[PDB]
């Protein structure tokens, strides 16, 4: 078999508005989840 070509355009992908926002959002949401858990600990009700 021939060595794989790293520059075959078919073995590449494009990340448009949606997936770039998906990455960003996930991180931010998880950062609010960690704050929701933090407020819960501080709530000694």
């Amino acid at each position: 078999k021939d060595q794989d070509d790293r520059d075959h355009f078919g073995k590449k992908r494009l990340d448009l508005a949606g997936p770039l926002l998906a990455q960003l959002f996930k991180t931010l949401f998880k950062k609010l989840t960690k704050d929701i858990f933090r407020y819960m600990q501080r709530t000694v009700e």
Binding site: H8, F9, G10, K11, K12
Partner: protein
């Protein structure tokens, strides 16, 4: 109606495309000297046909008159200058 299909660059590897439909689909059994030197339809095995070859180009390249009569990078250059050209950009 399955007359047209979506081919990715990976799927492209397993298909055979004719450039022109009419110019690459009949058979044979005088010619204009002015026209460019073209290839045959020796392929029996044609799976797909190119809608129009000029669709290989992007927005910029598509404003170039006769880009097929130019030196390769001269087109590349104009595909930068047309963006730096003035004109109406929106009616508002």
């Amino acid at each position: 109606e399955g007359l047209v299909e979506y081919i990715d660059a990976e799927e492209e590897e397993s298909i055979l495309i004719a450039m022109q439909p009419e110019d690459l689909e009949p058979a044979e059994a005088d010619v204009d000297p002015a026209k460019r030197i073209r290839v045959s339809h020796h392929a029996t095995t044609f799976t797909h046909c190119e809608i129009h070859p000029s669709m290989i180009l992007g927005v910029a390249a598509s404003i170039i008159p006769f880009p097929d009569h130019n030196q390769s990078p001269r087109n590349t250059y104009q595909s930068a200058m047309g963006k730096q050209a003035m004109g109406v950009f929106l009616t508002n």
